[PDB]
Each structure stands twice: as C-alpha cells, then as structure tokens.
Scaffold this motif. Structure first.
Motif, short mmCIF file in Angstrom:
data_model
loop_
_atom_site.label_atom_id
_atom_site.label_comp_id
_atom_site.label_asym_id
_atom_site.label_seq_id
_atom_site.Cartn_x
_atom_site.Cartn_y
_atom_site.Cartn_z
N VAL B 6 0.80 -1.22 0.00
CA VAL B 6 0.00 0.00 0.00
C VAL B 6 0.83 1.26 0.00
CG1 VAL B 6 -1.90 -1.12 1.12
CG2 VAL B 6 -0.19 -0.04 2.45
N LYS B 7 2.15 1.16 0.15
CA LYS B 7 3.01 2.34 0.15
C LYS B 7 2.69 3.27 1.33
CE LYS B 7 4.88 0.83 -3.50
NZ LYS B 7 4.86 1.58 -4.78
N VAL B 8 2.75 2.73 2.54
CA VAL B 8 2.66 3.53 3.76
C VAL B 8 3.59 2.93 4.80
CG1 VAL B 8 0.34 4.27 3.30
CG2 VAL B 8 0.74 2.24 4.60
N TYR B 9 4.36 3.77 5.45
CA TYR B 9 5.43 3.35 6.33
C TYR B 9 5.37 4.04 7.68
CZ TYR B 9 7.26 1.69 1.93
OH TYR B 9 7.41 1.08 0.71
N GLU D 25 7.63 9.54 7.29
CA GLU D 25 8.44 9.17 6.15
C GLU D 25 8.70 10.40 5.30
OE1 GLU D 25 6.32 6.34 3.89
OE2 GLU D 25 4.81 7.76 3.18
N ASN D 71 12.66 5.54 5.95
CA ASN D 71 11.85 5.62 7.16
C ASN D 71 12.51 6.63 8.09
OD1 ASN D 71 10.20 5.26 9.31
ND2 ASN D 71 10.60 3.07 9.56
N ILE D 115 12.67 2.97 0.90
CA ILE D 115 11.23 2.75 0.83
C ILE D 115 10.65 3.72 -0.18
CG2 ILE D 115 11.18 2.01 3.22
CD1 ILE D 115 9.94 4.76 3.85
N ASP D 116 9.71 3.25 -0.98
CA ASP D 116 9.06 4.14 -1.92
C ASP D 116 8.17 5.13 -1.18
OD1 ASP D 116 10.24 3.07 -4.18
OD2 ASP D 116 8.69 1.54 -4.41
N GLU D 118 5.28 7.98 -1.96
CA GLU D 118 4.40 8.69 -2.87
C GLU D 118 4.55 10.19 -2.64
OE1 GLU D 118 0.41 7.29 -2.47
OE2 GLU D 118 0.79 5.40 -3.52
#
Lengths: 246, 55, 246, 246
Positions: B6-9, D25, D71, D115-116, D118
């Motif tokens: 989902v692209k959330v970290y 992030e 992160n 980490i990607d 958006e």
C-alpha cells in the motif's frame, strides 16, 4: 568474625551492581586469601566469576574462612547509597548479620541479615578458545548498543589480525569492524577463523558499567561460549562466561 | 509485505486483535489496518467503523 | 496595590516548592513588614511557617496589608519556569489578579487569579523542647534517604553531646550516629535524653531542597513534635512542625 | 551510486530529528547541487522545507540526481546513535540500500532498505508576509514553553518596532513582549499591524533543538501561516510553514 576496609565504595558498588544485573542471590566465599564470588544465572546461560585478592583492600582482616549469604538486591540498594570517595567497611561477628559501615563525612551503619544460599558449584577452567582479543570498553559498549537496534543476537567474527562484529534483523544491517591498526583494538590473538552468536540482552547486562578507560579480554571459539574478563584495580578481575546460541 | 503493497510506512502503531473470535478466524488483510492507522480511525467487530451518538 | 522585586527567582521558586510539597493552597499575609505564610497539611501532621522580612527583597513596595490567596500548584509551575538569575517581580493593583514578571534576558508577564482561602489560624509558640541541634543539610538529607530503605518511621535519639538517628524494619537496620566531634554536627544542646519517631514520608517532603551548605535547626522532646528551621538569605527562615508517631 | 561525507554527525542527526518530529516518512531529492527535502505533516498544517547545499559537506559525491525513500524513524534511531564529532558517511550503489558509515574512533556500517514514497509536491513560494522578525533561539523556545502552561494556541502580535507574544486560557494569562531595544530581538521589519494564532503543539515540535546561539526568521501576516527559518552551518537552512487557527 572478620572486618574489611575498602576505599572508593562507589566503584565496589558499581561492580557489585554488575554482578547484580544477572543473579539475584549469591554467596561470598571469604578466605584469608581474599573475597571470592562465583555463580550462574537462572537461565544457565552466563557464569559470573568474581575474584578479589585481599591486596586491593586498604585493610583486610579475615579470621578463618566462611561463606556469606546475602540478598544481592538489598546489598545493591545499600552499596548504591555510598558515594565517590566515602570509605566502605564490612564487619561480621558472632550474630547472623553483616554490618556495612559507610564513613565519609560521617559514619553510617547498616545491618543485613545473611541468607542461606544453596551452592551449586560448577568450576570451568580453561577451555578450547580459538581467538582471544583485548579491546577498550566503550568500543564494545557502543557496539552492543548498536546491535540492540537491529536484532537480539549479536554475531562475532574473528579473523586474522581483524575483529569484526555484526548483527542483522529483518532489513537493517549492523557491522562493526576493527583491527590492530585501529586505535580501540589493543590486541588480537588469531589462531584461526572464529565465529559465534550471543544474546544481545546478556551482553547488555555484561558491558554496562564500562568507561573508555576499560580494557576487556574475550576468549572464544567457533560456536562455543565466550569468556569475557576485565581487571578491577589491576588485581582482582571479573570474568563472565556466556553460552552461544543455535 | 503490507507496507510494500500500500506504500505507507509512517505508522506510529498498529493495534491488533489478541485472538480471532470469529468462527472461521479468517484475518483481515493488513493493508486495511495500515490505512486505518494512517488516518487514525478505529474498527469494530465486523470490520465497519461506527460512531455512537445520542439521537 | 503593591509591587515587589526579588532577585534570584530560582531560589524563591525552590522554597515555594518546598512549601508546595505539603499543602495545595495557601494565603500570603503580606504586610509592610514583610511577606508571611503559615499553614498546615491536610493530615494535620505538619505545620509550615514561612517568614519573609522585607529586607531580603531588592525592592519591597507594600501599601497597607492584605492576604493573597493563590493556588500553590499553579504558582509552583509558574515560579518553576524562572531560572538561575532572572529577576522576579510581584505586582497587584485593583483587579483580582497577581502579576508575576520574570525579567532576565527579556520580560515575561503572567497573571494568576487569586483564590479565597478559608484561613484556619493556629499559632504555636515556643514549646518544651528537650534537645536542640544544628546540622548540615546533606547530613539529614542523606540520613532520611537512608531510612527510606528499611522503614517508614524514622526514630531520633538525642543524648549528651551525641545525636543519633535510626530506623528498623522487618530485617534490616539503619543507624546514623554523629556528635560535636564529627564535622557535620555543628551544634548540640542536650538538656537530657530525648527520643521520638516521625513519618519518613513527611521528612522526605521536608528536607528535599537542601545542599551541603545548608544549616538546619531541630528542637524536640520525648514523644512530641519536632520543629525544624533553616534560614533563607540569612534573614527569612522557614520552620516546619512535625507531630511524632505512637 | 553516490557517496557523501559530512562532519559533526550529531548536529545532522539533531536536524534530522527536527524534521522527524512532524513527519514519519520522507524522500530526499539528492541532486549534484545538494541534498533537498520537502514534505508536509499528515494534518496538512505544517510544511517542512529542508535545503542542503553541497558546500556544507566535507565531501560531496553525487553522480546524477535521485530521490531516496527512507523511514524517518529508523534513520532517526540510526543517526541518533552517532556522537559529537564522529564522521558521517552516506553511500549508495546499485542495490536498494543506503549505507551509513559512522567513523570516529572506529568505523560502523549500517544499511537501510529504501522505501518508496508517494510524492505530493506542493511548492509554495514567497507570499504576502506583513511582518518579518529575527530573534534568538532560546527566546522563542522559552516563550513557547511558557505558553504551554496556560493554553494550546499561542497568539503572535507584531507592532511597529515591537514584537509581543501572548496566550490566554481559562484563568491565567501569559505575555512576552520585546523590541529592538531588548537584547534578544535582533531585528524587526514592521510593515503594519500583524496578528495570528498557532498550535502551541506544532510550535513545540518546531523550536525544540535550539540553543541560545540560534537566530530565527519569522515572516507572517494577519491571520495567515507563519514561515520560520534558520540556517545550518550558515549555508543550508530549514524553513517551516505553519497554518494559523480560527
């Protein structure tokens, strides 16, 4: 029926803390040679070996040899109440009490009911230790604190003239290399390739209480327990024995 | 795999369930948990988000 | 409608904290002589007597005499926000507010709505106090912290030219002796044998906020309240009155 | 496939913490000009703008331009493990990892899976800012900490040659005035009357990490977002953009 006089009570309280963070009770084999301690964690994973030659004490008065049984917790709170330079005294007569006398600016007397300790003696002399390294204290202390980030099991790797530590978790990777060329690595004695892993928790209990001016010895072999050592006032040194994992 | 999907970290926490009480004990996909946490909305036993109000 | 100017706001905040840890509200009897405080714990076990002669203040401007009613908690957070050397100012005009001005590097103004305080005045002058001792601050502070280990009631024993403190719990025993010969015991005034016991909690509330350079007075008799005292800038001193136990 | 060498890792870790306390992030737009950051809180209330010119780095080696996705929490724990003067290095080759090398007394290597992120780019250039003030760091830090006592929304008032802050809650009142005459107010640029209010929480996240030797810029207008700024080694400065309330 002895009396003992040790200076720098804060130091002694520090080391007694060190022994404290692994076991909860323990007995002190006081002999006219000196004060001795030896015990093992509940988990049977670490062995604490305390050796105190009488020479370190400003006064050492033992009449015979006897074993003290004390609550490491209560003694830890007590000794912890001493400070930088106030003098420590340990007295014991007929009764079943230990008298701790902290005299700096003033005298303060505490009494501790001695407790029976079921002794399980396991003496473990020299063993096949492939590699053997000396290193400054804060080096290893920093290192362990670093491996605390990524995992719970710190892996040690000893190669020819090079000592490297490491640990890996899910995605994070931690590595600490250093050799004789580097400053913090005082010595390396490489017999051959050595590798092990150890509980980062236990190591954290070990190395806490180490300044930069602290030299540490480390003997160990491929998949076998480490033995750590470091001296205390250059005469009586402490030695831990940590079983590896896997 | 969830964060990958989902692209959330940046989730502070992700409070789970101590034990599935449903009959099947089929678990919700984690992605939805991440999105709930990311917006800070809570869930109820069916998977829907409710809001009590004296009517 | 007064104004007051006191230097070293951090000190004053410290003492106001000292008064704070026992009572929650209190009134300040401001007179042209000086600022006064007097109140008792909820438990009716301790009496705090604050005396502030106007001389201590870098400026003291009172027009008449009035009683302030303030939330000791709110004032404690406020004064606690002052620092080492920034200047304290206390202003009050027509309205029902107290204006606190902290001006060091800059000026900062706070306002506190005054609160009505139902005054229960109990003035307790000199009483039959068998023994009377002066002692350094950190001596008693260390001592109380020691008795915190073994029990909740600290026993005091005053003998001829010798002051000794003690406490005993289930097993452990704590003793602190010292006399005029010892350094920390500045004075002893022995009329005869005195002994008492006091709530270690209350004592801990008392002696917190005491450096080594703090002299303390202690008057008391056999099974009767202690009266403690210590000066503040050598003019206005604080005095606690602690009822014994049993 | 770059490498970067920055000295004083503790400082850089401090600022990365500063960015950390608002977002979780973020991506780093690394260009051969320098390292850049730009992101917004979840609440869409604050905008963090990080600008790092390559000049600040003791070594700066970028081959092309790429965006890192990390992160902020993990990087925050990592960088936080650096100390006062140990050297920081940032390396990246083919694989999808970032290698952080802390070399002071020794070398320590960490790896962070990228980490990607958006990216939601919202660039907000200069805007109508009525007043503009420079002020020492600890001034505003103290001030915000003061407004934390009485309320959750700190109000700012900029008048001709005078800067005043304030906040009011149920009862208490907090005011902080200062002008060019005062020491802590380095500059004021008054175009006309300005007034706003801001979330004291967000401000607290902002000003933490500021010593007395910290100059801060503040541009803003009547009921509109503040823009705060402060330089980092005199070349690369950070800028926050806080939406007002009401």
């Amino acid at each position: 029926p002895f009396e003992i006089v040790f200076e720098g009570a804060k130091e002694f309280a520090q080391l007694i803390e060190t022994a404290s963070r692994l076991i909860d009770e323990a007995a002190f084999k006081v002999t006219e040679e000196g004060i001795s301690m030896r015990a093992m964690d509940p988990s049977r994973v670490v062995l604490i070996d305390l050796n105190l030659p009488a020479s370190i004490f400003s006064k050492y008065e033992v009449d015979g040899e006897e074993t003290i049984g004390v609550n490491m917790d209560h003694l830890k709170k007590v000794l912890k109440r001493g400070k930088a330079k106030e003098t420590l005294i340990l007295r014991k007569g007929e009764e079943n009490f230990l008298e701790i006398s902290l005299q700096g600016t003033a005298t303060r007397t505490f009494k501790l009911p001695l407790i029976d300790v079921e002794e399980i003696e396991v003496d473990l002399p020299e063993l096949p230790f492939t590699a053997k390294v000396v290193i400054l204290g804060d080096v290893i202390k920093e290192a362990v604190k670093d491996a605390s980030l990524v995992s719970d099991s710190m892996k040690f790797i000893a190669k020819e003239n090079e000592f490297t530590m490491r640990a890996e978790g899910e995605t994070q990777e931690v590595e600490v290399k250093l050799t004789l060329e580097d400053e913090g690595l005082l010595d390396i004695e490489v017999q051959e390739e050595t590798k092990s892993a150890y509980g980062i928790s236990y190591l954290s209990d070990m190395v806490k209480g180490l300044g930069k001016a602290d030299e540490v010895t480390i003997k160990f072999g491929n998949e076998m327990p480490m033995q750590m050592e470091y001296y205390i006032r250059d005469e009586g040194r402490l030695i831990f024995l940590l079983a590896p994992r896997v | 795999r969830a964060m990958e999907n989902v692209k959330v970290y940046g989730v502070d926490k992700l409070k789970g369930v101590m034990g599935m009480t449903s009959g099947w004990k089929m678990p919700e996909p984690l992605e939805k948990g991440l999105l709930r946490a990311k917006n800070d909305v809570y869930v109820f036993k069916d998977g829907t988000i409710r809001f009590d109000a004296t009517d």
